[PDB]
């Protein structure tokens, strides 16, 4: 259905569509080594990608419908230089006609203009004054559809955000090429991550957009907070979606100690620019390889692993004694050499047979049996972390649960200073 399918095939970025439009990569374009489909464009002159569209698919019409989709990770806007400064990022305008995607402080703009100076804009806006943002510095799926008879629509993660009429626009003659480059951006350290760009010769419907969203999600691979693939041997600050205001801490190390959700999660801010909940708090978790010959360091849907915990700069092993009384098994931080026969094998999870689910850690005993998903339980006003089979069952519901976690690694797009 796509007339343009930009994907990193072999060792080059090409167009997997039947048209095979030529692609020129500037010398300052960065590709994520662990997932070369993710492209990083800096606010630097030669950090650009130009797509030369086959003359056959260049838009030039009064009634042809078309859409476009792609994922993007926009770093948090850090200071006043980014206020009121709309910069283009994907340009298909030629002689002031065609389309283009732009950004500005807290927004993603779509622009359509015909050859008679008649134009329309569709915008998505998100705030940087929020505890936990689904959008800031995280991979978002953007979809823009255009029905020449009535409206243009912008979707974010499969849901309709806004729509505007375009029926009054006459002939639109877009550009022969598409320029992916930060244009007119005043912030010298600005950049964006983008991947899976597509172009369609029709107005995608809600269902098609959803299937596009679910399929390009790679549901078989776990993701960290930013939406990147979850990795092994990579320290992560933990976030429990059920109770975001707290962070993981360790009472004491050892079998007679425990892990719990401590006091108030802080806030990070830059006056007049952003105010969000602190994300680099608590004892870090490191996913360790168990009985695996994993070449890459990517964590997949049913991988069996070990969870190391960092306490006062020393790594310990997450474990528990399942013989413990009660359904909820309280977890502890064990000296690695002394884990003995304690349960410690964790099955990572990204989906149920089933759909997405945030509960991603199912502890198993040494007999290959479920102890339960890792979450937390209230023990006399103390929220200790536990592995509970109760979670498994209630999962009959895809809502946020006590076992819904988020792994957050340090990222430059967030800008918070750790420790």
Q: Provide the 3-class DSSP secondary structure of residue 371.
A: strand
Distances (CA, A) of 237 to 42, 258, 267: 27, 18, 15
* Binding annotation for a ganglioside GT1b (d18:1(4E)): 242, 328
**Stated resolution in angstroms:** 2.3
Q: Could you write out the DSSP letters of every residue in 209-226?
A: HHHHHHHTTTTTB-B-TT
User: Strand runs (DSSP E) across 132-217, as ranges?
Assistant: 140-146, 151-156, 159-165, 172-173, 177-183, 191-200
Phi (first) and psi of residue 49, to 5 degrees: -135, 125
The neighbour count for residue 368, using CB atoms within 10 Å, is 9
Expt. technique: X-ray
Helices assigned H by DSSP within 301-341: none
Contact of 148 with 116, CB cutoff 8 Å: no
CATH architecture of 1-224: Sandwich (2.60)
Q: Considering the domain 225-419 in this protein, what is its CATH number? A: 2.80.10.50
* Binding annotation: 242, 328
Q: Where are the domains of the chain?
A: 1-224, 225-419
């Amino acid at each position: 259905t796509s007339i343009l399918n930009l994907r990193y095939e072999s060792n080059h970025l090409i167009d997997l569509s039947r048209y095979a439009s030529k692609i020129n990569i500037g010398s300052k374009v960065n590709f994520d080594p662990i997932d070369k489909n993710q492209i990083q464009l800096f606010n630097l002159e030669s950090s650009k990608i130009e797509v030369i569209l086959k003359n056959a698919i260049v838009y030039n019409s009064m009634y042809e419908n078309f859409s476009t989709s792609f994922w993007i990770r926009i770093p948090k806007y850090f200071n006043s230089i980014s206020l009121n400064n709309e910069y283009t990022i994907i340009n298909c305008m030629e002689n002031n006609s065609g389309w283009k995607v732009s950004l500005n402080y807290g927004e993603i703009i779509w622009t359509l203009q015909d050859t008679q100076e008649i134009k329309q804009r569709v915008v998505f806006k998100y705030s940087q004054m929020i505890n936990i943002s689904d959008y800031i510095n995280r991979w978002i799926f953007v979809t823009i559809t255009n029905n020449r008879l009535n409206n243009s629509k912008i979707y974010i993660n499969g849901r309709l955000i806004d729509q505007k009429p375009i029926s009054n626009l006459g002939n639109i003659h877009a550009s022969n090429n598409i320029m992916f480059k930060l244009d007119g951006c005043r912030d010298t350290h600005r950049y964006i991550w983008i991947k899976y760009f597509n172009l369609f010769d029709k107005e995608l419907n809600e269902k098609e957009i959803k299937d596009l969203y679910d399929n390009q999600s790679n549901s078989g691979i776990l993701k960290d907070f930013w939406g990147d693939y979850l990795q092994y041997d990579k320290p992560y600050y933990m976030l429990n979606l059920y109770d975001p205001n707290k962070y993981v801490d360790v009472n004491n190390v050892g079998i007679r100690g425990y892990m719990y959700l401590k006091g108030p999660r802080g806030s990070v801010m830059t006056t007049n620019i952003y105010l969000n909940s602190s994300l680099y708090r608590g004892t870090k978790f490191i996913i360790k390889k168990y009985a695996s010959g994993n070449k890459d360091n990517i964590v997949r849907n049913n991988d069996r692993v070990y969870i190391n915990v960092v306490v006062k700069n020393k790594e310990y092993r997450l474990a528990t004694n399942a013989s413990q009384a009660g359904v909820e098994k309280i977890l502890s931080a064990l000296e690695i050499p002394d884990v003995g026969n304690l349960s410690q094998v964790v099955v990572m999870k990204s989906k149920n047979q089933g759909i997405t689910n945030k509960c991603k850690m199912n502890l198993q005993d040494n007999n290959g049996n479920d102890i339960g998903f890792i979450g937390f339980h209230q023990f006399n006003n103390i929220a200790k972390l536990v592995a509970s089979n109760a979670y498994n069952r209630q999962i009959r519901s895809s809502r946020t649960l006590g076992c819904s976690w988020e792994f957050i690694p340090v990222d430059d797009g967030w800008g918070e200073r750790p420790l």
